[PDB]
Amino acid sequence: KNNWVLLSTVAAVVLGITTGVLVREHSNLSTLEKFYFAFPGEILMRMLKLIILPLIISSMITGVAALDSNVSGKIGLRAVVYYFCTTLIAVILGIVLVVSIKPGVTSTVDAMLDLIRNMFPENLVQACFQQYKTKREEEYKIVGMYSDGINVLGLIVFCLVFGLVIGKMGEKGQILVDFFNALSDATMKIVQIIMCYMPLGILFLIAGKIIEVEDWEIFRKLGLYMATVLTGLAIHSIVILPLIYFIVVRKNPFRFAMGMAQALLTALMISSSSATLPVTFRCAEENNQVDKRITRFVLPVGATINMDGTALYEAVAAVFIAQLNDLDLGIGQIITISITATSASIGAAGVPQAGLVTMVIVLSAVGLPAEDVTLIIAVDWLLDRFRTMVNVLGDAFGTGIVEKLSKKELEQ
């Protein structure tokens, strides 16, 4: 019905819980038998991990090269600055809520430097399956290591520089742009094939998790995770973003949101910001009367670099999974998670189920068990819909900001 992706995921979740409760109470499997029961779920995890490397590399180069076209002049610069500030506040807001609420609960300088080191790997081939970690030994020295763990930060940064370089090379770099455009297109087709197998893998992933839960405390922790994500998205969409619009534009932001209601409603159903653009353009220019020039240079940019939703959904999810693993975490470790979350999303911007694919990238890069994402998919459909609604609203408000900040340019 063109919504099989949503129906299949919910059906898999519902049947996964039904299978888990029945098997747990009507059977007593051993440790080895329980592992085999989740094997279809394990195979799904390998497919998602397998497609990470071509997805992020092809998409980041494709997106960055395409972004070079949209981001031109001062008008484009206003949107880039606007999306940096709103994303920055979302990153801080997400960390404050997950650290204070503490959903799944019960050196900082080294982590920060390791973050910069990973952004500049010493070998691109090794960056696909290894990450750099440092330690303090004893008067105290520093010892690097290099351990298994795809270096998403290094690959994304290089693709950023690579994408910008080829985009500016004109015709000499067109073959590289065409090559990675087709590779990106092919990878999305491959993920669609994996998405067809997802309902079977999700069924056994969730079902196996129900067999292994000793106490219902995990369900309570999942509820706090939903509250943390919903609370952060609500505050950003209701308080922070309208406040930013109000001060810069000195107009009522709530009226501005009414014109986008058609786009906001479409954002939930489709659950993709890029696919909602045609509706977003119509609402922004017709209902909000925003100049058509701004919407052309702002909305395409916002569909790529608007990470407010990721900073409030995927970053919070990664820290929540870390807290589930009894990791004490720190300022340096949380900042590493937050940057990884935004880097993963930009590399998986148009992938079906960005939320699932992005989280698997974040967990793999950070080091948390990629199988702990099972709890995320149980409500990912619900939270991903709200995440996209905030992203579209952020871009819609961004168009009003750039118009007010670039009135003189429009006159000229």
Ligand X SMILES: Cc1ccccc1Nc1c(-c2ccco2)nc2c(Br)cccn12
Ligand Y SMILES: CC(C)CCC[C@@H](C)[C@H]1CC[C@H]2[C@@H]3CC=C4C[C@@H](O)CC[C@]4(C)[C@H]3CC[C@]12C
Cβ atoms of 334 and 408 closer than 8 Å: no
Residue 411 CB neighbour total at 10 angstroms: 6
71 contact, one of ligand X, ligand Y, none, CB 5-8 Å limit per kind: ligand Y
Question: Side chain identity at 150, as an amino acid letter?
Answer: I
Q: Which stretch binds ligand X (CB under 6 A): 130-138, 172-180, 184-192, 336-344?
A: 336-344
Which tokens belong to 383? 């939270």
- The candidate with the shortest Cα–Cα distance to 315, out of 338, 292, 282, is 338
The site string for ligand X over 303-332 (x = CB under 6 A, - otherwise) reads --x-x-------------------------
Q: Residue 314 CB, nearest distance to ligand X (Å)?
A: 11
Is 167 annotated in a binding site? The answer is: no
User: In sequence order, what are the residues at sequence separation of 6 or more whose Cβ sits closer than 8 angstroms to the Cβ of residue 128?
Assistant: 53, 150, 151, 155
Is 147 annotated in a binding site? The answer is: no
87 contact, one of ligand Y, ligand X, none, CB 5-8 Å limit per kind: ligand X
Q: Residue 298 CB, nearest distance to ligand Y (Å)?
A: 12
Q: What is the DSSP letter of 38?
A: T
Is 326 annotated in a binding site? The answer is: no
Q: Residue 157 CB, nearest distance to ligand X (Å)?
A: 10
Binding ligand X (rule: CB under 6 A), the pick from 93, 198, 346, 377 is 346
User: How close are the terminal C-alpha atoms of the chain, in Å?
Assistant: 48
80 makes contact with ligand X (CB under 6 A):
yes
Q: Residue 265 CB, nearest distance to ligand X (Å)?
A: 26
Is 302 annotated in a binding site? The answer is: yes
Q: Residue 303 CB, nearest distance to ligand X (Å)?
A: 12
Is 87 annotated in a binding site? The answer is: yes
338 makes contact with ligand X (CB under 6 A):
yes
Beta carbon nearer to ligand Y, 211 or 305 = 305
96 makes contact with ligand X (CB under 6 A):
no
Cβ atoms of 80 and 71 closer than 8 Å: yes
Q: What DSSP string describes 119-184?
A: HS-S-HHHHTTEE--EEEE---EEEE--EES--HHHHHHHHHHHHHHHHHTTTTTHHHHHHHHHHH
d(CA 384, CA 375): 14
User: In sequence order, what are the residues at sequence separation of 6 or more whose Cβ sits closer than 8 angstroms to the Cβ of residue 58?
Assistant: 180, 183, 184, 187
Q: Residue 213 CB, nearest distance to ligand Y (Å)?
A: 35
97 contact, one of ligand X, ligand Y, none, CB 5-8 Å limit per kind: none
List phi, psi (to 5°) of 72: -140, 140
Beta carbon nearer to ligand Y, 260 or 337 = 337
**From the centroid of its chain, how far is CA 127?**
20
Binding site for ligand Y (CB under 6 A): 64, 67-68, 71, 80, 119, 156-157, 160-161, 164-165, 168, 305, 342-343, 346
Q: Residue 66 CB, nearest distance to ligand Y (Å)?
A: 9
User: In sequence order, what are the residues at sequence separation of 6 or more whose Cβ sits closer than 8 angstroms to the Cβ of residue 247?
Assistant: none
Is 245 annotated in a binding site? The answer is: no
Beta carbon nearer to ligand X, 80 or 165 = 80
51 contact, one of ligand Y, ligand X, none, CB 5-8 Å limit per kind: none
d(CA 135, CA 213): 35
d(CA 126, CA 138): 29
Indicate if the alpha-carbon torsion angle 346, 350, 353, 357 is positive or negative. Answer: negative
Is 394 annotated in a binding site? The answer is: no
- The candidate with the shortest Cα–Cα distance to 198, out of 54, 48, 55, is 48
Is 70 annotated in a binding site? The answer is: no
Q: Which stretch binds ligand X (CB under 6 A): 84-92, 322-330, 350-358, 374-382?
A: 84-92
The site string for ligand X over 231-270 (x = CB under 6 A, - otherwise) reads ----------------------------------------
Q: Which residues make up each annotated binding site for L-aspartate?
A: 271, 273, 310, 351, 387-388, 391
Q: Which residues make up each annotated binding site for Na(+)?
A: 83, 86-87, 302, 304, 306, 308, 345-346, 348, 391, 395
Residues that bind ligand X (CB under 6 A): 80, 83-84, 87-88, 91, 305, 307, 338-339, 342-343, 346
